[PDB]
Every structure is written in structure tokens, then in C-alpha cells.
Amino acid sequence: DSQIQFTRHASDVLLNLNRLRSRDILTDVVIVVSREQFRAHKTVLMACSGLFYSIFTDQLKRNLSVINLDPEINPEGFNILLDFMYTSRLNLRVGNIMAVMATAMYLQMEHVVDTCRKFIKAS
């Protein structure tokens, strides 16, 4: 409310969280997408994705160390979205727009889908 605001703190936290991912420090889940595998932190996955929230919030699945995604998910599209989660930067190109949008819908990241919609429209 009337507390002092650190305007860079949130971005600095996310940057260190991504650094921890890049060194595999306290990563607690691998996400299998067809042939690929991505290690990550369940907390960040839950904070950023409705699908991952709905999985790990259920005590039936909260302790899983492996999550197999839908085999139709494109790994490049997932990687772009995983990067976004940890960076706030979304790499939308003409060559990946369709794969990134579809993957964002499957992961229930509405703002990204909403931004994919505006990207479409601005093309």
C-alpha cells in the first residue's frame, strides 16, 4: 500500500530464476514433448500456465517428476513459451506464430494467446 516500491525487483527475481534453470539448480520436473525433454521449476510452471497449475495443484499429481505433454505439441513452440515464462520476452515470428499460438492455448496462457491474436491482426 504505502510501502516502498522496488520497480526492478520482479524482473531481477525472474532473471535469477532463469539462471537457476540454466544451471539445473532445484529443477523438480522434466516436461517431455515428443522427443524432447525440458527441465523446469514446478512453481514457475504453475504461476505462468493454467494447465500446469491445474496439474500440480492437485495432490494426486503434485509430486510427479515427469509430465508427458500432448504428442501433437511442437517442441520449438513449447520452448518459446518456456523461455517466455522465465524471461517475459515472447519470440513471435512469421515462421512460428501458428505453433506458438496453438501451444499457448494448450498451456492456458491467455495473455499470450491474446497477443498472438493481435500479432495476427497486425500482419
Ligand X SMILES: CC(C)NC(=O)Cn1cc(CN2CCN(C)CC2)c2ccc(NC(=S)NCCc3c[nH]c4ccccc34)cc21
**Contact set with ligand X (CB under 6 A):** 9, 12-13, 16, 19-20, 46-50, 53, 108-111
**Helix, strand, or coil (residue 31):** strand
- CA-to-CA distance for 40 and 21, rounded, in angstroms? 6
**Helix, strand, or coil (residue 66):** strand
In the shown chain, the binding pattern of residues 9 to 48 toward a second copy, with x for contact by CB under 8 A and - for none, equals: xxxxxx-xx--x----xx--------------xxxx-xxx
Q: Are 82 and 37 in contact (CB under 8 A)?
A: no
- CA-to-CA distance for 39 and 24, rounded, in angstroms? 7
CB-wise, 34 or 108, nearer to ligand X? 108
Picked from ligand X, a second copy, none, the partner binding residue 98 (CB below 5 to 8 A depending on kind) is none
In the shown chain, the binding pattern of residues 47 to 86 toward a second copy, with x for contact by CB under 8 A and - for none, equals: xx-------xx----x---------------------xx-
The CB-nearest residue to ligand X is 50
- CA-to-CA distance for 31 and 12, rounded, in angstroms? 25
